[PDB]
Each structure stands twice: as structure tokens, then as C-alpha cells.
Design a protein around this ligand. Structure first.
Ligand SMILES: NC[C@@H]1O[C@H](O[C@H]2[C@@H](O)[C@H](O[C@@H]3[C@@H](O)[C@H](N)C[C@H](N)[C@H]3O[C@H]3O[C@H](CO)[C@@H](O)[C@H](O)[C@H]3N)O[C@@H]2CO)[C@H](N)[C@@H](O)[C@@H]1O
Ligand SMILES: NC[C@@H]1O[C@H](O[C@H]2[C@@H](O)[C@H](O[C@@H]3[C@@H](O)[C@H](N)C[C@H](N)[C@H]3O[C@H]3O[C@H](CO)[C@@H](O)[C@H](O)[C@H]3N)O[C@@H]2CO)[C@H](N)[C@@H](O)[C@@H]1O
Ligand SMILES: [Mg+2]
Ligand SMILES: [Mg+2]
Ligand SMILES: [Mg+2]
Ligand SMILES: [Mg+2]
Ligand SMILES: [Mg+2]
Ligand SMILES: [Mg+2]
Ligand SMILES: [Mg+2]
Ligand SMILES: [Mg+2]
Ligand SMILES: [Mg+2]
Ligand SMILES: [Mg+2]
Ligand SMILES: [Mg+2]
Ligand SMILES: [Mg+2]
Ligand SMILES: [Mg+2]
Lengths: 144, 129, 52, 203, 97, 212, 50
RNA sequence: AGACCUGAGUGUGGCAGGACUACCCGCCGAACUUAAGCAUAUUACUCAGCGGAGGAAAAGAAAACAACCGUGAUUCUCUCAGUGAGCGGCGAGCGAAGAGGGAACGAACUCGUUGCCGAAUCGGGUCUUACAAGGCCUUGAGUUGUGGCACAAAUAUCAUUU
RNA sequence: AAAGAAGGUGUUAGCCCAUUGAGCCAUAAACCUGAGCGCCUCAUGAACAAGCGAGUAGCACUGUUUGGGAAUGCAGUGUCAAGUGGCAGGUAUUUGUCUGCCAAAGUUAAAUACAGAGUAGGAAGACCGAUAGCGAACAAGUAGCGUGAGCGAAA
RNA sequence: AGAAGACCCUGUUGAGUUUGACUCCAGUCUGGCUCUGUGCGGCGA
């Protein structure tokens, strides 16, 4: 909306908030990120530190489909179990089966407390997630 | 005409490899005039002689003998070793068409000839060439 | 629109303002100013676009 | 078959027999004109591979191009601006000479639709190509199903637009995969596609 | 025969268990077979035209020894190194009668 | 005064908008609802043109590649000429009776082959196949009580009379087994992982030890 | 100086030596082109040419 | 004498030429500008210049992607991705592809080669209501190969009358 | 009133006029219809061991192009293949295993563009309203101007 | 009055001209292979 603009307010004030001494002039400091090491060195060092250089190996032709590995924790496995089926879940009885790769979530991690024992079918799992679901009463079944 | 006459000098002055020399070495007259007279009498039947014997055989439901002619057909008659003698011309205008042709008869042991022809072979069989 | 002339500024050294002016002569538009939001027959400020 | 002896004889181009025949041919070709019509092609095995038949409307022309790189035609070797664009002699054309030979035939004999050509002979100064053309108004060519497509008026100068085999070479259309991604269907068809600022309607 | 896959994501045979099928014969399986007529044609043409300037040079000093110099002269002029070995090995057969 | 702003990288330096000197390089979607309407109007004009055959030909169920998408399925290009022959069907003949055929696809497993044979077995039982001559019936064809009750689908995939894409059924709730209560799962995963991850790195150390 | 290599200055002088190389480009090859010897020939008379 | 080959001259029947050129195909090809200077780089494989079609053009039927439980011609769209790709005085800046959801889609075929046949071909005449994918006739082209049959969607060749 | 429609008429029209529907009439071919339907003529569907594109690909130097980096594509020249296989698998080399495909010949609809085209005809708009909007609401690329390329009104 | 000082200075503004400025380019020269074949020899390794 043009009517909501600062232009309409300072309409009549003959400098438009740019001043009498130093005017509004076309590109007084350069076009773009010019002068990053020269005359904007204090801006580029203070706010944007690790710019300006090289780091690490070069992965020519990265494919992001084989390096696909999403992550879910033990305390968020209730997101994948239906509400009808968590209430019937007791340790030593019949537990729900969660197929992780049908939901995203290629890897199970072991953060937090698992609020419902279940059988997790995961492509990957960690030390402290395997340890912590076998004591909670479920298991983890590997899949491909 | 001034460069078809200098083309003939230049093929003579330069040292010719033994694969194109062999076409300058030609079967003599008594064996060429004997050969093309035998190619003449077993020439292929003409268009009228092949339009008849078929219209006289569509009445039977109502090739006598010839020499093998053609660069695709004579080649098959040596790969199969069916020809008893092959007669090669000496002056085909891209010479690579029959440059390999005496060595195929030599690998398969069919008797060949290089005669002074391509106008005289086509006259024997009813063609131009 | 407003830009389809071959106008150039006359520079400085005449008592006329530094704007592009219509080339040629023999017509009433010749020498007249061009190519600005304030000239007549010139182009509007920030001409409107269909990718708004 | 009879082809296999012709094809393997034209792979022995550096042997002493084929170096004698191309010696004689390159002599008698540089005493002819730039464009020469033949009754029969010089290489019939390679002409019929490339599309020629011994029909009525087919016809073969041998076309001569000069060898070497492209001297940039700036006046007196003097050129301006940035130093990357300063070279005159080492610059090279982005069309091969087989395409240039096909375009010199078809810009000269306008009533004929050229299909592709083939290498014939080299000299130190010239290269020769037999360019197969075909007469689109010949009644044989119009009634024959495997060649009548050339009579349609979208093939009028295939050579001038890079639609022959030698045209498709210097366009890079020998490659299809990750080796041709910037150039499928055209460099301009991919430049336009990759650079046009798309404005979605509700955004 | 097609070596069934183990149903976990990592390791040897690391896939989904899926009852693999045998490879089926294609028309492109007929390139790895001996071409006994294509060789007989090439043997007639080679016994017709003589030898290349490369092929005479490679085996004029394959008589005096110099087998790694024949391989270096081929790879300079053939570019490829597998083709350099094969061209030297085709000259050693013409020297074997 | 610049402040704590992100470094811009806006990529608009190549003469893209039509000004008084530039033709532009710009693509706007103002005809989006009129080409939306055109394609539908032209699919209803085509569904009349073909009637009563399906508007879209039958396509196989194929998996998806690239381990991100292994668990997904979609519709392929055409049935291979081994799924067609396993359905007792000529591939040159199948293209006339509404089936897409793909000579390139290789059938590397029997589960993916049997899914698409069952799509072909379902399709032939729904197929009507009108006669050439509606007086002299030549083969198993329609009987004109079928060649008059016949209709088409506009079902957008050809999956009206073959059914949708068959995903597998999720596993029923079960108990934790005797092995799964005590067998460590990470150690078996990492042993299998490290076997291929250090193959060659440890297989040359034995090669550095079989030789002295 | 725009027209000729010897032109210009405040005195009419050739600045550089007026004996130019054989390999000078056209425009630079003015003056005494590839002079083997200059000056008033004091002595005999050598035939001129290569 | 005649032939064949390579070239002429005329007769007859045809065609190309210029226009337009928004989009599209092939080449040719800058500089201002940006880098707070400037030469690499940028602008831009853009403007201008030359050639050529169409109602679209171009591409297109795997010497492809992938690394999967695999996919399946091209083109286009959203996304991939302003990218923990990559290129770059590694500066200013630039810059994709595979996968996935879709649009379209009856989408596939023809030579060459090989094998088996060998003028069964093509053009001109002329006769059938007919410049017949018909007969009949023609040395006129053509055997220095026109055509037919088979080649992964394949199960193969000729008969013939149903 | 299945018609309210938005133009004209001396001043604000559903009723003054034209309009605004169902349908009627007439059609060179082409297009579409049991690949519409007969006849003549002419084709013919189904039954009863060989190889597959050679100055090519590659390689070297140079030039350019690319995100393509010990070289993505191309060009020049030198060199120049293999098939008792070759190409691609995004860090160069030699050697293996693997996987995909079979370059160097040809046609091919639609989905895409129309960023200063054109024909025939529609729909219009939170646009402009005679210094605005096309230069041009008018005998406008006109009168005029310049040797010319060209420039170019007012109204 | 005339005309955004024609002097002087500033600008990370030009341009004509110069040159053992910086980066290059035509031209001229020189070497390599090429075009480029046939003989009898000779100096060589
Ligand atoms: N208020 C200033 C005006 O903002 C206008 O643009 C404003 C919006 O129209 C514009 O919104 C854009 C949207 O148009 C575009 N299609 C996509 C984008 N996601 C939006 O940006 C939005 O998300 C970004 C962060 O992602 C916010 O910074 C921004 O404020 C928000 N509007 O960003 C601006 C924030 O108000 C015009 N650029 C211009 O008229 C003017 O600068
Ligand atoms: N020829 C190379 C060019 O030399 C130029 O630079 C050269 C010039 O500045 C200068 O060249 C001078 C020349 O001006 C002056 N009039 C004559 C003098 N002979 C030259 O000198 C140069 O050339 C001769 C060899 O002929 C050398 O003996 C000498 O060492 C060398 N300095 O010496 C530099 C070294 O050659 C440019 N840098 C460039 O165009 C290019 O590098
Ligand atoms: Mg480093
Ligand atoms: Mg303009
Ligand atoms: Mg205006
Ligand atoms: Mg793409
Ligand atoms: Mg024209
Ligand atoms: Mg600009
Ligand atoms: Mg500046
Ligand atoms: Mg242009
Ligand atoms: Mg096309
Ligand atoms: Mg044929
Ligand atoms: Mg090459
Ligand atoms: Mg095409
Ligand atoms: Mg008014």
C-alpha cells in the first residue's frame, strides 16, 4: 500500500530523511558487497566472521539423495504411534510396530525418555538408543 | 582434357604399390576374346525374356542359366565358393570397389582374371558397365 | 513509451537546462526536452510493470 | 558381404596403397572447381550409409573448404577494449569445416535439400567433402516414403541451422547425459530456461 | 545365483530382501563373441594394403629388441595405453611368421 | 549505514526486465487459470474423441530409485515384454488394446514383476474389446450387450479399473521376541557397516602380512 | 607526432636514432632503413644491394 | 566404325532468389557497467552484424540416470537450489544435474550393415471415369545396386485358396 | 421476465428501438460419424550363423565455452583406434571386479515460446483520459527537416 | 549583461600524444613437422 509509506508523511519536507549536509546519492559506498576487506572490514569482521577463505574437501557432484538420514528421538516416538494403540501398550505384552522409513526418519536417536514401549523398525540406531529401548521394554528391528 | 592426360602421366611416373600394379597387368587377347564370348552366351536374360517365362508360368498356375553379375552377387559367389571363374575389370572409377577383389579369389582359391574391360564386360552381358 | 526519440542533451554552454532534447529541426518538437518524468511526451516515473 | 571389404579398405587410409590413391585424387581435385558435381559418389559405401540411393532425385556434389584456423577479420589486426578479446590469429571458428562445406553447397544450389556429407580427401591446403543433396520436386523423391520427408518445407535449409550430422556435432548433440546438460535442446534454449525470472502468480 | 540381499542398510549385500531374478539375454550380448568373418575380411585387407607408417616403425625396432620403446611409440601416437599394448601385440604376431 | 544484515546475493545483474532498451528475460503466469481451463476443456474434447476407451493408457507400478525414495511406488512408463508374456499377452498386440509397453525396463526382481502381472490380469478381465465386424464376431470379444453398456473413465491415471498403486501393509502389533530382548542391535549394525567400510583397508593389511 | 615518427617537439629534431631495423613494422620503418653504415661516404664506392 | 567414361551445346518439364523475422535455429560478437582503481572475472556465451525455417522451432526413441526394493525417448512446470554442489584477483560475483509431485502421451518408426533373394525397382508412354502403391509396353536410368524378407515388441523361409 | 444485457433515442428507459432465447434455413472441398456406407478395382492380415555406421572416437598442442574443477562441450592442426569389444560411472595414473548402455546415419505428434510479427474473430480491465495514453482519438510516420543515414510535430 | 572559469585545485573523471611504465596484439624474423616424391652415395649411431 502506497498510502502507508513514509514517503507520504515526509511529502513536503524537501529532503525525505536524508539530510542537508550529506545527500542521498547513488551508491556512496559501492555496489553490493564491495570493499569487504577494504572499507567495510569492520562490518564484515564483526557481524559476518568466518567469510573470506577456504575450508575442507571438495565433494564434486554432490547427490543429496544417498546422504539422506533424518532423525527422531525416543521421546518423540509418540508422534508416529496412533492414539488408539499407545494405550494398549504395556511392557511384556503386545507392542505397536513403528516403521520409521515410511515416515521420514531414517535414524533413531536416544534423547529423552521414551513414553511408550514399541518395536521400532529403523535403518540406523545409536548406542544409547538401542540400550534404552531394550530396557524400556521394546526393541529395534533393522531395515533397509 | 588437359587434366585427364596429366592424370595418365602421373599414374605412370609415380611408383605404384603392388595392389594397383596388378590391374595394369592384364590377361591377353586370346584368353580375353575366349572369355567374353563365353560370358556372352551365358549372359542374363533380358527384360522381355524375363517378362515372358513368368507370364508363361502364371498360365502354369492358371531362369535357365546365366553368369553371376553385380558387385554384391559376385562377392557372394566367392564367399560361398560357388564361382568357378571370376572375371574382374581393370578400370572402375573408384578403384577401391574391386581393389580387394583378386585377394578374395586368392584366399578362397577361385581362378580369377583381370581383363581389359568394363565396357566390354557390360557389352557381353547387356549393360553399359 | 516516452523513450522512442533520439534525444540527447545539448550539454552546457547554452542558457538551457541539462536535459535530453529532441534532435533535428523544422518541427515544433525539435529542441524540446525529452526523457524525464517532468518533460511532456517523456516517460513517467517508475513505469508500471505486469510482474507486479 | 561386399560392403565389409569396402569399409575395411577405407580404414586403412594410411597404408601405402590408399596413400597412393588419395595422392592422385588430391592432385586432380585441386585442379577442379570449389564445387563439382559427380555422377557417382567417390565412396559409395559411405554415401549409402549416409543416405544416398541410386535413385533419380539424389545427386552428389564435392565441395572444397580451406584448412587452418580462423583469422579474426579486424582491420589491420587492431581491436579494442578488454585484452581477452585482443587475439586475431589463434582464434578458431566454432563450426567444423564439414558443416561449412555443407552450407556452401546449399546456399549456392537453392533448389536442393542437402542431407549430410562425408570426408573425401585432404591436402595441405584443402579438404573435400561429397555433399549428398536431393531434389524435392522430383516425382521419385515425393512418392518414396523413406525420403519424402525432405519435401516438407521445414527442411528447406537444414545446413544453415545446424540440423545435419556435422551440424549436430558442433552443437554438442553427440552427448546426452551430464555432458550435454547446458546444451539440450540448444544453448539458447537452456540459457533462456535457466535465466528467465519466473514470476509465479500467487506468491 | 543372484546373491540375495541382507535386509539391513549397511554391509555386504545391503538391500531389501526382494527375490532377485537372473540376468536375461539381450541382443547386446553378441558383442563379446568372436567375429570370425569380420576377422577374415580384415586379414584379407591387411594382406592387400601393406602396413601403416606406425606399423612399420613399431616392428622395425621390435626386431632389435626395444619392446618398451615400441610401447612408448604407440602410446604417443595412439594416445590410449590399452590400444598401445594391443598394437604392439599385433606386430609381434606378424613377426611370428 | 549498513548493520547486521545478511550478505545479500540477490542475482539480478543480467538485464532481465523489459526497459526501454532491453527486451527482457522474464516469464509471468497470468495465463495460469486459462491454460488450466484449456487443458481440461481439451481433455474433455479428447475423452469424447476416443470414446469408450480410457483417456489414459494403463501403466505399470514401478518403485522409486535412490534410497531416500525406496519405500515409495509410482506409475511407470510401460509394461516390460516379460510382464506382458507372463500375462499371456503379445507386446505388439497389447499396445492396441490400451496398454503402454516399455522395452527398456529390466525386471530385476520377482515381487515387482508379479505386481504388474496382476495389473495386467485385472485389466483383461475388465476389458471389453469390441469386434471388428459387429455382425461376424471373430474371437472373444463384446456381444453387443457389452458393446452398448460400455463406458470410459477420466480417472486421471487409468487406475479406475486396475485399482490404485499398491503400497505394502503396515505390520500388526506383536510381542517382543526372545532374541530381540537381549541381542544388541547397534553392535551388529556397526560390525556389518565396518566390514564394508574398512574392506581393503584391513584386506591389504592381511596382504601386507601373508607376504612376510 | 600523429603523422610521422620523426614529427613533433619544440625543435625540429629526430629524437631516436634514425636508422631503423629491417624488422620494423610498417609505420615504424621510416628513416634510414637497415643502414649498414651512414655518414658522408669517405673513400671508395661500395656497390649497393644484397 | 562403334562403345564406355569424363565433359559440352540446345530442346522440354520444373525449382531457388525477395518480403516478414515477435518467438525459434546456426554462426559472429562488443562496450558502457560492476569489482568503490583495474587488466582475470562481470555485464554476457547479451546488444549490434550475417545466414535460415515454421506455425511453432529446436529436442527426441539411450554408447541415459543411477548405485536403488532400482529408473526408462524428448520437451515443459513446480521443486531440487541461490545450493554445508561447484566455479571465482576463492574478490566482486556466478551457478547446475539426478531423484520426487505433475503437464503431454494410441509414440513410435526408416535406412545402412549382416543373412537370404537379385530389377521383383524407378521414370516415361499408353489403356482401364484413373498423371491408380492396376495392367501392358519401354534401353530410358539402374547391377559402381533399385527393391523385397528377417534382425529382442523376434520365433523367422517360400508357397495357395480359404 | 428461461429475457434486468451493460448500446441508441432531445433529461436518469426492463416497457420507444436494437439487443438478450429455444430453435429454423442454406452449405465447393476438407474435417467428424460400426477406422460412416454401397459398387468397381487393388493390395494382404490370420489360419490350415553372420554383423550392426573410420580421418570416426580418442590422444597431444593451441583457442574458446562451461558450475564442470589434472580439462563440461566444441574448433583448428598433428596424430589416429578397437571389435577372438567399446562408451559412460564428475581428482590424474597402471591394474582388476562391477553396473548401465551400444556413438560415429534418418524421420517423429502433443505438452513449451511468441520479450517491438501477421491473418480472421472474440473476452475484456481497481489502466490512461486530449501536455495523459501509441509519435499518431484528427487526410500521422503526416506537414516539416537534413546531401544523406534519418529525424519528426502541432492538431 | 554574455557563459555551470577556458587559470588553479579536487575526483580512485576523460582524451590527444610520448616512452628502457604495466599487460598484451598485428608485422618481420627464426626453429620444428608438414606439403614432399625418385636414384646413386657419404658423414654418422
Ligand atoms: N515495505 C517496503 C515495501 O515492501 C514491498 O515488499 C514487501 C512484501 O511485498 C514482500 O513480501 C515478500 C513476497 O512478496 C515474496 N513473494 C516472497 C517473500 N517471502 C515475501 O517476504 C516476506 O518474507 C521475508 C522473509 O522471508 C520478510 O523479510 C518479509 O518482510 C516478508 N514480506 O517483502 C516486503 C516486506 O514488506 C516491496 N518490496 C516494496 O514495495 C517496498 O520495499
Ligand atoms: N619483446 C618483449 C616485449 O618487451 C617489452 O619490454 C621491453 C622494452 O621495455 C624494452 O625494450 C627495449 C626497447 O624499448 C629499446 N628501444 C631497444 C632495446 N633493445 C629493448 O631492450 C630489450 O630488447 C633487447 C633484445 O633485442 C635486449 O637486448 C634487451 O635486454 C631488452 N631489454 O625492454 C623490455 C624487455 O624486452 C614489453 N614489456 C612487452 O611488449 C614485451 O614483453
Ligand atoms: Mg587449502
Ligand atoms: Mg531507445
Ligand atoms: Mg507519454
Ligand atoms: Mg532439465
Ligand atoms: Mg530468403
Ligand atoms: Mg546499464
Ligand atoms: Mg565508481
Ligand atoms: Mg541480434
Ligand atoms: Mg521438427
Ligand atoms: Mg538396399
Ligand atoms: Mg580425429
Ligand atoms: Mg529432427
Ligand atoms: Mg479537457
Amino acid at each position: 500500500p502506497t498510502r502507508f509509506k513514509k514517503c507520504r508523511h515526509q511529502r513536503g519536507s524537501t529532503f525525505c530523511g536524508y539530510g542537508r549536509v550529506g545527500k542521498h546519492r547513488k551508491h556512496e559506498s559501492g555496489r553490493g558487497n564491495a570493499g569487504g576487506m577494504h572499507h567495510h572490514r569492520i562490518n564484515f569482521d564483526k557481524y559476518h566472521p568466518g567469510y573470506f577463505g577456504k575450508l575442507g574437501m571438495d565433494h564434486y557432484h554432490r547427490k543429496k539423495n544417498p546422504m539422506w538420514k533424518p532423525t527422531i528421538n525416543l521421546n518423540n516416538l509418540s508422534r508416529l504411534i496412533a492414539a488408539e494403540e499407545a494405550a494398549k501398550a504395556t511392557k511384556g505384552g503386545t507392542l505397536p510396530v513403528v516403521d520409521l522409513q515410511s515416515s521420514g526418519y531414517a535414524k533413531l536417536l536416544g534423547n529423552g525418555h521414551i513414553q511408550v514401549p514399541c518395536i521400532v523398525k529403523a535403518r540406523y540406531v545409536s548406542k544409547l538408543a538401542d540400550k534404552k529401548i531394550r530396557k524400556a521394554g521394546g526393541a529395534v528391528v533393522l531395515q533397509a | 582434357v588437359t587434366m585427364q592426360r596429366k592424370k595418365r602421366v602421373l599414374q605412370r611416373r609415380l611408383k605404384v604399390p603392388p595392389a594397383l600394379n596388378q590391374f595394369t597387368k592384364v590377361l591377353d587377347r586370346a584368353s580375353r576374346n575366349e572369355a567374353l564370348k563365353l560370358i556372352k552366351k551365358y549372359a542374363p536374360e533380358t527384360r522381355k525374356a524375363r517378362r515372358e517365362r513368368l507370364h508363361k508360368a502364371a498360365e502354369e498356375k492358371k531362369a535357365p542359366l546365366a553368369v553371376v553379375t553385380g558387385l554384391q552377387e559376385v562377392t557372394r559367389a566367392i564367399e560361398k565358393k560357388q564361382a568357378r571363374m571370376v572375371v574382374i575389370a581393370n578400370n572402375v572409377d573408384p578403384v577401391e570397389l574391386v581393389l580387394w577383389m583378386p585377394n578374395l579369389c586368392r584366399a578362397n582359391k577361385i581362378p580369377y582374371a583381370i581383363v581389359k574391360d568394363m565396357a566390354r564386360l557390360g557389352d557381353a552381358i547387356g549393360r553399359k558397365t | 513509451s516516452g523513450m522512442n526519440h533520439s534525444a540527447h542533451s545539448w550539454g552546457t554552454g547554452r542558457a538551457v537546462a541539462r536535459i535530453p532534447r529532441i534532435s533535428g529541426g523544422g518541427t515544433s518538437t525539435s529542441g524540446a526536452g525529452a526523457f524525464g518524468n517532468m518533460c511532456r511526451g517523456g516517460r513517467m516515473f517508475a513505469p508500471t510493470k505486469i510482474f507486479r | 558381404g561386399a560392403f565389409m571389404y569396402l569399409n575395411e579398405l577405407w580404414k586403412k587410409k594410411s597404408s601405402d596403397v590408399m596413400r597412393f590413391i588419395q595422392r592422385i585424387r588430391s592432385w586432380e581435385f585441386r585442379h577442379q572447381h570449389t564445387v563439382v558435381r559427380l555422377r557417382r559418389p567417390t565412396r559409395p559405401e559411405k554415401a549409402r550409409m549416409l543416405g544416398y540411393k541410386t535413385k533419380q532425385g539424389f545427386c552428389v556434389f564435392r565441395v572444397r573448404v580451406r584448412r587452418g584456423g580462423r583469422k579474426r577479420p579486424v582491420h589491420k589486426g587492431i581491436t579494442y577494449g578488454k585484452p581477452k578479446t585482443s587475439g586475431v590469429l589463434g582464434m578458431k571458428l566454432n563450426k567444423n569445416n564439414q558443416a561449412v562445406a555443407e552450407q556452401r553447397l546449399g546456399k549456392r544450389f537453392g533448389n536442393l535439400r542437402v542431407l549430410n556429407s562425408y570426408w573425401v580427401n585432404m591436402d595441405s591446403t584443402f579438404k573435400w567433402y561429397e555433399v549428398i543433396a536431393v531434389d524435392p520436386m522430383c516425382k521419385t523423391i515425393r512418392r518414396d516414403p523413406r525420403i519424402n520427408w525432405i519435401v516438407n518445407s521445414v527442411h528447406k535449409h537444414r545446413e544453415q541451422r545446424g540440423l545435419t550430422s556435422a551440424g549436430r556435432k558442433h552443437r554438442g548433440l553427440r552427448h546426452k547425459g551430464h555432458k550435454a546438460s547446458k546444451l539440450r535442446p540448444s544453448y539458447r534454449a537452456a540459457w533462456r530456461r535457466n535465466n528467465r525470472i519466473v514470476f509465479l502468480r500467487k506468491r | 545365483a543372484p546373491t540375495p540381499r541382507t535386509g539391513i542398510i549397511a554391509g555386504f549385500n545391503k538391500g531389501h530382501v526382494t527375490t532377485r531374478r537372473p540376468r536375461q539375454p539381450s541382443p547386446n550380448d553378441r558383442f563379446a563373441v568372436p567375429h570370425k568373418h569380420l576377422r577374415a575380411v580384415k586379414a584379407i585387407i591387411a594382406d592387400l594394403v601393406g602396413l601403416s607408417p606406425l606399423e612399420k616403425r613399431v616392428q622395425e625396432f621390435l626386431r632389435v629388441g626395444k619392446e618398451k620403446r615400441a610401447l612408448k611409440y604407440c602410446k604417443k601416437r595412439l594416445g590410449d595405453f590399452t590400444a598401445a599394448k594391443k598394437k604392439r601385440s599385433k606386430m609381434e604376431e606378424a613377426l611370428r611368421h | 549505514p549498513k548493520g547486521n544484515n545478511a550478505i545479500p546475493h540477490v542475482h539480478q545483474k543480467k538485464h532481465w526486465n523489459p526497459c526501454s532498451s532491453q527486451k527482457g528475460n522474464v516469464k509471468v503466469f497470468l495465463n495460469q487459470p486459462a491454460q488450466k481451463h484449456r487443458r481440461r476443456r481439451l481433455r474433455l474434447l479428447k475423452a469424447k474423441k476416443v470414446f469408450p476407451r480410457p483417456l489414459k493408457a494403463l501403466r505399470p507400478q514401478v518403485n522409486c530409485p535412490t534410497v531416500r525414495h525406496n519405500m515409495k511406488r509410482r506409475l511407470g512408463r510401460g509394461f516390460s515384454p516379460a510382464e506382458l508374456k507372463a500375462a499371456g499377452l503379445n507386446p505388439q498386440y497389447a499396445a492396441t488394446i490400451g496398454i503402454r509397453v516399455d522395452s527398456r525396463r529390466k525386471n530385476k526382481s520377482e515381487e515387482g514383476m508379479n505386481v504388474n502381472v496382476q495389473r495386467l490380469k485385472t485389466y483383461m478381465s475388465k476389458l471389453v474389446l469390441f469386434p471388428m465386424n459387429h455382425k461376424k464376431v471373430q474371437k472373444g470379444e463384446a456381444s453387443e450387450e457389452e458393446v452398448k453398456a460400455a463406458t470410459q473413465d477420466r480417472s486421471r491415471f487409468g487406475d479406475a479399473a486396475v485399482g490404485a498403486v499398491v503400497y505394502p501393509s503396515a505390520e500388526t502389533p506383536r510381542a517382543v521376541s526372545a532374541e530381540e530382548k537381549s541381542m544388541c542391535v547397534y553392535a551388529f549394525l556397526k560390525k556389518n557397516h565396518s566390514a564394508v567400510r574398512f574392506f581393503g583397508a584391513r584386506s591389504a593389511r592381511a596382504a601386507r602380512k601373508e607376504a612376510a | 607526432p600523429v603523422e610521422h615518427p620523426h614529427g613533433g617537439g619544440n625543435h625540429q629534431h629526430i629524437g631516436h636514432p634514425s636508422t631503423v631495423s629491417r624488422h620494423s613494422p610498417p609505420g615504424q620503418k621510416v628513416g634510414l632503413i637497415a643502414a649498414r653504415r651512414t655518414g658522408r661516404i669517405r673513400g671508395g664506392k661500395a656497390v649497393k644491394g644484397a
